[PDB]
């Protein structure tokens, strides 16, 4: 198909908004749900929220600004939940921060979110004369050097390793994305509709089908911030501006008998947990090394 980069982004935004309106129209009347706060700090608090339009961030706004800024992931019952995905049914809520003794759930979400930011920067950095295909964001533990994102480039761009300036160019663009405040939007979209969003990308269609096989309902999760739409597993941090230190470490080559995937690795730290300059440089060097963990 003959679609310019501006048009294909506009088409996806139109499709995503159309799906969002359909979900809102499925609830004709505002329904009141009673949410009991089971957090350690303020037990016994009962919230009376609206169905499918009230997010846990709006739930946190009732308490104080401290819950608005410290909280990252909300715990609906026993399931992790984003702070911008609207609630569905009456349940119990708990807020998890970095300072908690078990930030493992929050650490995984932050690592996933930073990978998505790199994909947006990589996709909209190459010239339109080259084709960029985003494959996926492999799940690597935080104990590893850094988060990695897999990108397939053009065939005529096979013999090209980015230079130091080119690697730093991605970081500057990422920081510009950090400078503007863009919330993360989570939407549940049916599998066939998701295939329409990523029609151009062959690899994304395969990723959607694989994810849809794990759920009997053929339901997938889509996350959008700004004008970029991507499919990812698990929740994400509520706000883009949570990241403070961001850097693209280096690239690596993984050659398969069918295609070549470029592995972009970068290391980031949040505002709350920013480190010293001496410690940051030590951690940055370890991020240069190859990361190999898929299954």
């Amino acid at each position: 198909s003959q679609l310019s980069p501006t048009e294909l982004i506009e088409m996806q935004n139109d499709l995503f908004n159309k799906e969002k309106n359909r979900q809102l129209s499925l609830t004709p009347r505002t329904e009141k749900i009673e949410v009991k706060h089971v957090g350690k700090t303020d037990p016994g608090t009962v919230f009376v929220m609206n169905k499918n339009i009230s997010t846990p961030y709006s739930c946190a706004m009732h308490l104080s600004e401290w819950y608005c800024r410290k909280s990252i992931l909300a715990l609906v019952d026993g399931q992790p939940w984003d702070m911008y995905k609207p609630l569905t049914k009456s349940c119990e809520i708990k807020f998890l921060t970095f300072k908690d003794d078990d930030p493992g759930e929050v650490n995984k979400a932050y690592w996933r979110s930073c990978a998505m930011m790199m994909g947006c920067v990589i996709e909209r950095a190459f010239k339109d004369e080259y084709v960029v295909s985003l494959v996926r964001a492999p799940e690597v533990p935080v104990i590893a050097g850094a988060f990695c994102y897999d990108v397939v480039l053009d065939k005529r761009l096979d013999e090209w390793m980015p230079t130091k300036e080119n690697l730093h160019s991605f970081t500057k663009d990422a920081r510009a994305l950090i400078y503007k405040d863009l919330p993360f939007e989570t939407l549940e979209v049916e599998a066939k509709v998701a295939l329409e969003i990523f029609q151009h990308n062959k690899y994304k269609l395969d990723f959607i089908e694989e994810k849809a096989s794990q759920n009997p309902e053929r339901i997938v999760k889509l996350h959008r911030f700004g004008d970029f739409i991507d499919v990812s597993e698990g929740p994400l941090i509520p706000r883009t501006s949570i990241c403070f230190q961001y850097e693209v470490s280096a690239v690596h080559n993984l050659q398969t008998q069918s295609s070549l995937v470029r592995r972009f690795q970068g290391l980031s730290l949040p505002v709350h947990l920013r480190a010293h300059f001496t410690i940051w440089n030590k951690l940055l060097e370890r991020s240069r090394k190859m990361v190999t963990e898929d299954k």
């Binding site: 350690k40 700090t41 303020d42 401290w66 410290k70 300072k99 908690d100």
Partner: protein, 110 residues
């Protein structure tokens, strides 16, 4: 010495609102992880310490009733036991303080 002329309000406003004389903001305010109240980074929580101080007063009040004299002090170690507990083998040979309330969560038995 005495002033020569009345200070104009224009001069007074400059002096009374100088950045030095203004109140400086504090950027070291944090929420206490245990109780969720406010405290500074280098200062113990006011609410949590007040919780401990009230309990400490009750324990000391019980000790006073166990030593009537003003110059009576134990020659051995002291162990505090709450309701539903009995002294251990390592705790024998020490004075026992009994409290009716249930053992608080923050207090840890050894």
């Amino acid at each position: 010495a005495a002033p020569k002329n009345r200070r104009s309000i224009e001069v007074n406003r400059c002096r009374r609102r100088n950045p030095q004389k203004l109140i400086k903001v504090k950027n070291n305010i944090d929420v206490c992880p245990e109780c969720g109240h406010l405290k500074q980074k280098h200062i113990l929580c006011g609410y949590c310490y007040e919780k401990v101080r009230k309990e400490t007063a009750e324990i000391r009040r019980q000790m006073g009733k166990q030593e009537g004299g003003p110059f009576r002090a134990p020659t051995t170690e002291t162990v505090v036991l709450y309701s539903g507990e009995t002294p251990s083998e390592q705790d024998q040979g020490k004075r026992i303080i009994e409290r009716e309330r249930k053992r608080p969560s923050w207090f840890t038995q050894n």
